[PDB]
């Protein structure tokens, strides 16, 4: 299966899961400060699944590793900001970050995979 662009509506198929999922809601969209006045003391560069979709939809994705590091940063943000390892919105990321991780596995192998059999000759 060595299609070198079949990552990117596999990423839009996987977004769209994750918006379904409770435990998304949040994540989906940048934290607002007014309520955390503190963020950005703790958090250098806020991350959040619609920016990670917009970035994907304008073409300024090359690769499905970049998207993974975008998306693995708002788990880091999350545990970087929690005052607590039992905090809600902590613990929804755990159980987001897992089912990301579970299917982007095979995202990341086929594209790999595409890339050297271009380069096979
Ligand atoms: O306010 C937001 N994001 C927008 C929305 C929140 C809910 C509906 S929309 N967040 C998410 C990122 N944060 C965290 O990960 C943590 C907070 C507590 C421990 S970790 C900060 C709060």
């Known amino acids: 299966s060595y299609d070198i662009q079949a990552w990117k509506k596999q ?3 996987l977004l769209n899961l994750i918006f379904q999922c409770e435990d998304s809601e949040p994540f989906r969209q940048p934290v607002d400060l007014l309520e955390y006045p503190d963020y950005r003391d703790i958090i250098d560069t806020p991350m959040d699944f619609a920016t990670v979709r917009e970035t994907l939809e304008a073409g300024n994705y ?3 590793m970049e998207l993974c590091k975008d998306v693995r940063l708002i788990f ?4 970087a900001y929690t005052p607590s390892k039992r905090s809600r919105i902590y613990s929804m990321s ?4 897992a089912f990301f ?3 982007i596995s095979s995202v990341l192998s086929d594209y790999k995979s595409a890339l050297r059999f271009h380069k096979r000759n």
């Open 11 to 13: 990423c839009e198929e």
């Open 62 to 64: 090359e690769s499905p």
């Open 76 to 79: 880091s943000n999350s545990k």
């Open 94 to 97: 755990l159980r987001l970050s």
């Open 101 to 103: 991780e579970e299917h």
